[PDB]
Amino acid sequence: LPRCDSPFCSLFRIGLCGDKCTCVPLPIFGLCVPDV
User: In this UniProt entry, which cysteines form S-S bonds?
Assistant: First the structure.
């Protein structure tokens, strides 16, 4: 599959990275993981 929706996101700002992948808990703007 193609790259995730967004490059990074915040622990609270999960909605941002919820189009193709899931937001990470890492408050350091971790890298979203591709949910297959």
Answer: 4-21, 9-23, 17-32
d(CA 34, CA 12): 19
Q: What is the CA radius of gyration of the chain?
A: 9
Q: Give the tokens for residue 11.
A: 């622990």
- DSSP conformation letters of 6-36: SS---SS-TGGG-SSSB--S-TTT---B---
Number of domains in the chain: 1
Give, as one character, the DSSP assignment of residue 16.
G
Per the structure block, which two tokens stand in for 10?
């915040």
